Design a binder for this molecule. Structure first.
Ligand SMILES: [Zn+2]
Lengths: 248, 44, 50, 94
RNA sequence: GAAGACAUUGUCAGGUGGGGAGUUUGGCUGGGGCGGCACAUCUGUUAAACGAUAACGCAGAUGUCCUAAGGGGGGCUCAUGGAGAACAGAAAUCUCCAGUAGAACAAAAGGGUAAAAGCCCCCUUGAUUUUGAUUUUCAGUGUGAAUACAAACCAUGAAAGUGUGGCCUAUCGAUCCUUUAGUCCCUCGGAAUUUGAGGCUAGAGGUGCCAGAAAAGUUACCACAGGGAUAACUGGCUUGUGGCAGUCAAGCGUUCAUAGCGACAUUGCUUUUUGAUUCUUCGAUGUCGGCUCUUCCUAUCAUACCGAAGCAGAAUUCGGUAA
RNA sequence: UUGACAUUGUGAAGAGACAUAGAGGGUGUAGAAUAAGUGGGAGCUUCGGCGCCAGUGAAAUACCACUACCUUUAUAGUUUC
RNA sequence: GUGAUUUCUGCCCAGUGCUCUGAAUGUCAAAGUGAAGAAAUUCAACCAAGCGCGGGUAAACGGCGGGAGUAACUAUGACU
RNA sequence: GCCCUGAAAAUGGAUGGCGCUCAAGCGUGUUACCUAUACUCUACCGUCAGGGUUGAUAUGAUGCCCUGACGAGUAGGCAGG
RNA sequence: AGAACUGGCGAUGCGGGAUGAACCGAACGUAGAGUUAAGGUGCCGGAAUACACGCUCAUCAGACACCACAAAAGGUGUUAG
RNA sequence: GUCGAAUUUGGGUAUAGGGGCGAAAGACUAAUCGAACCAUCUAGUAGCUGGUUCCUGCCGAAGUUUCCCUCAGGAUAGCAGAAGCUCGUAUCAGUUUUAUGAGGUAAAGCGAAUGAUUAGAGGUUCCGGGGUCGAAAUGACCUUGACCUAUUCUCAAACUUU
RNA sequence: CACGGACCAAGGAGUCUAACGUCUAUGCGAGUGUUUGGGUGUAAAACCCAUACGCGUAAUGAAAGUGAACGUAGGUUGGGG
């Protein structure tokens, strides 16, 4: 038997985390061969019972849509009990830790009436979402994703760095995170232009004026997503801050 | 078997889904506990 | 699908009440002047089983 | 990609017919009126028991849009449309 | 007696509604299913000295990037090595010699390129308009990309000249529908005005299953038309692996390479084993084992006769004919 | 199942949104001080009223570029509960 | 639903379901109201149930893993 | 070069068989001989082509006459019957 | 399993290879005579138990290419070198 | 097996087809049931199977290109037939020669390239990416980083001048 | 050793239609078509017929709309007769 892990994305952030974790826990003992692939890889085993062990290991740490198929090897006579080659298809959810997404209308209306403009926040057995404009966290299961799958609007590569100017933590707070009313500029318009963007981020407790952060700039983007085309373009943020590029 | 009843069928004897039916359900669905505010034994 | 025995209990035809041996409908007497004003006396002739 | 807010380009006007200065700005579509013949027809067709009667497109593949620039002459106010390639990032270079 | 212009009843509208109805649930394919996309395309190789030439054949690649990484002109020459200069080190900056490209040219590989197609600087928007002819895939249809001119307007340069995107080869899309730009053109058909609508000419929104259906499963209760174009048990071909044999025999076998056992390998046998093929059977070849019964093969377990042995006898081993 | 219209007539009270003038509109240690954006703002005002520097400052004041957090009544009513 | 009797029926309301005598505006159709317009029409506010939020519920569907630390060693079917 | 051993498989059996040993075997060479719907000659049928003939006889040319070549055939096409 | 060139079968009979869809020869109107192909001439079987120089005796010889199987290693068995 | 009862049974009577009844097997519903029977729409459609009627003569193929929810099928081009039209030995040909061009395979020739080179002695820099946790103030972790010349040995062999 | 066929007789399977394409024959010929209908009739036939209509004689364009001789109805190359 064998399992075929795939994440249908070019950049696979939840995969390196996964294999790092696999070596951390040492769950790759009965692995007889590891074969790379286009977008994921494979793990080979000599008994179904050690493959399902690792499937159980995966379905607790990351979200998956797993299956099973058989090919017939040799119809053993005198018993009726033949032998076979198995194959499991694991599909990881194609969303990573820090991706901008646009949920569908009816799903967002059910996961707390959260806005569709969303950032992924944490990857586990379930996939966790957060609205940065206002601290509202949700959680979505794979059994609900794979019913009506959607795809991210922008990956981590499309990020671009900004330089923060003023940090107003007037906003409300939650654990580990606090809402702000930052003003912030781009490090291709500073020094040359004098236009600034004001953002209701969730980094009032982290980022101080004069350090480089990382965010999506929506106004310069040329997206085509039928869901994004279903939103009120005027209530869209022109910037979405994500993380901080601390200097080392 | 499932023609006969919603609880029907299966390679075991299981309902599959909850027996707490709604009140606004229809004829042929209301086979269980109909508008349960509560189920189960309280303490004994 | 079929219809369940709950759905089949509404037209009757075998789920009717078996009403041969019943003495009758057990019902208080009708509200009349004697019972709105004063009283009226009656007497038991037999206790029976329904 | 970047494209500045001005460029000198051929105006097809009756008066110009020369290279003139043109203000460029991105093309945004209209609001999809309701008294269009092909919306009236759709309404009339959906009106009934019927069902959904026309297709519905799910199987998207493209992740971009071809960029269209609306140029406008500064002396004629005559307009024009140019198209570019597909891109994920576009801004006007003011 | 109760309730009372509320219920009820009628018509619309929203929600709920597998309780029920109707339908669908892609292709390629060393079976089908996973996986992959060889389903639209690019490079080298397959490919066998024009061209064409397949495989779920190999090594890779595309669904992007750029107002400069496009265009024109000018000036300079790169990787690298050597000899030198305080801090200075294998390596910071400066100078000389050699240097046919061993560098770089957004990105795959291939081709190409040196007063350049590269490195720096200057001016710019030919990444423009009208429409046609041609080459490539090819039906000589489309789409896509390119080639060469014409009529205009522009840039650049002293000028010759070059420039109709990227040094060349890939980097993308029909009808219907919607929308925008334009002539300020046509029509709204009893005659007019203003809105509104429809039209013509170029474009965009998209079908990636990429010449382009709107779509989830199960049947072990199942069914029909058919198929050895195709799995099923049987065979027939093949020998990777199975079982057996022969030659080389390191070396172990009280010192005494085969009395005997065993390397490296090497040639090669049988169909009595798996794998592989799909050639015969899909409008009936009845599919495990056992009971029964007969015959054949020898690659001999015993029996008979021989030979050799670290074969005294005894007991064993090996060996030969022999079924 | 919920809403609207009709069936559907006759009433009485109360509360609520618009419609002109209202202004009660500015309250962390506290800086005198009950501090919204602001506007040139150190000056227009009768007495200079204060401010400018100063002083917590988040606020910077007077005066106004005069939009100004903008709170409850009164109007002829417009009408939902 | 379970299936005589006897003895027991543990821990979970996060999820899906069901439910509520809980909050109020976040969404929220048709009719109705207001504004612009010559009008068709367009826009806005108000807006029922439902959704959403909060709670309850397991003899309701069902689920009941893996670590990291208790000082020389030991980290327990303990403790954090 | 030949021959032998190596070289073992299952109904009784296959240089095709009998049978052959200075071959009726193997290598090589020389003539003679046998025979296919093939080749050559002739006759006949048919088709294809070229040409002569309305002198005018049976006015008919639908024909008559001369010359040469050729003939496989599934699906399928046409013609004459 | 997948390709390139030619030829053929399929659509194709005839002589030969005993037999065979594909090999050799050769492509077909009905018949006669003659000559040959590829293959063959002991008898079956039409045709030389023909000629010539040599090799081989096999206790499963050998005998018409495709074809219907055969290697490595050995023999003073023999022949020639 | 059961045999005094949830017993067996006649007659009458109710329930009728996506409906009935079911101590529940998808069982029974007139030899019919995972949806009865009868007539009609109905000569249902079938890219699938089978068959397809007389003679002779002449000519005579294809299993390949491109597109198709396309792979037991269609359109398209090709092959083939028939009808002939304009003309009358042109200028044509599955061919050769002469002249002039393109090619980069066979052959030839060179040493080499990063791995396992069967490796050998070493040289240590930090040259770091990526993942998690970072009210990031300063920053840690599991992870992957490192290499220095000598290049043998046998030929593994990538190339091009001709 | 794939499917059908025990046997005989009779029946038994690319037709009819509407609208069309190429080709051919015939009539008339920038015209053509008699046959909806009418007159007439030896009576479903045959014979006679006006008007209109159809196709064609003029195309193009989305449409409004415009609408085919510079010339011995052109020049050059070939061209039967
Ligand atoms: Zn202009």
């Amino acid at each position: 038997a064998t399992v075929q892990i795939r994440q249908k994305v070019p950049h696979k952030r939840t995969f390196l985390f996964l294999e790092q974790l696999i070596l951390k826990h040492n769950a790759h003992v009965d692995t007889i061969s590891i074969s790379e692939a286009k977008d994921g890889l494979d793990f080979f085993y000599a008994q179904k019972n050690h493959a399902v062990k690792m499937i159980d290991f995966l379905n607790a740490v990351v979200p998956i849509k797993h299956k099973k198929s058989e090919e017939l090897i040799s119809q053993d006579t005198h018993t009726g009990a033949s032998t076979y080659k198995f194959s499991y298809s694991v599909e990881i959810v194609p969303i990573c830790k820090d991706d901008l997404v646009v949920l569908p209308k009816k799903l967002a209306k059910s996961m707390g009436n959260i806005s569709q403009f969303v950032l992924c926040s944490k990857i586990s057995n379930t996939v966790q979402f957060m609205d940065p404009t206002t601290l509202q966290t949700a959680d979505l299961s794979p059994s609900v994703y794979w019913r009506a799958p959607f795809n991210a609007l922008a990956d981590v590569t499309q990020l671009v760095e900004f330089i923060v100017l003023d940090v107003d933590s007037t906003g409300i707070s939650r654990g580990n995170r606090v809402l702000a009313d930052i003003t912030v500029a781009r490090t291709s318009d500073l020094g040359v232009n004098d236009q600034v963007y004001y953002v209701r981020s969730h980094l009032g407790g982290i980022c101080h004026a004069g350090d480089s952060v990382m965010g999506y700039f929506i106004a310069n983007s040329n997206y085509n997503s039928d869901l994004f085309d279903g939103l009120n373009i005027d209530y869209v943020p022109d910037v979405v801050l994500v993380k901080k590029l601390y200097q080392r | 078997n499932p023609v006969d009843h919603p609880h029907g069928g299966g390679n075991h004897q299981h309902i599959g889904k909850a027996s707490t039916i709604s009140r606004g359900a229809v004829s042929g669905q209301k086979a269980g506990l109909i508008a349960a505010r509560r189920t189960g034994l309280l303490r004994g | 699908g079929r219809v369940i025995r709950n759905q089949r209990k509404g037209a009757g035809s075998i789920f009717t009440s078996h009403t041969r041996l019943r003495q009758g409908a057990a019902k208080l007497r009708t509200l009349d002047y004697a019972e709105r004003h004063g009283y009226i006396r009656g007497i038991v002739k037999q206790i029976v089983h329904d | 990609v970047n494209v500045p807010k001005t460029r000198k380009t051929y105006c097809k006007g009756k008066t110009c017919r020369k290279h003139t200065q043109h203000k460029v700005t991105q093309y945004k579509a209209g609001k999809a009126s309701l008294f269009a013949q092909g919306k009236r027809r759709y309404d009339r067709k959906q009106s009934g028991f019927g069902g959904q009667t026309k297709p519905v497109f799910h199987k998207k593949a493209k992740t971009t849009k071809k960029v269209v620039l609306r140029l406008e002459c500064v002396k004629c106010k005559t307009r024009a449309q140019l198209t570019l390639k597909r891109c994920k990032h576009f801004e006007l270079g003011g």
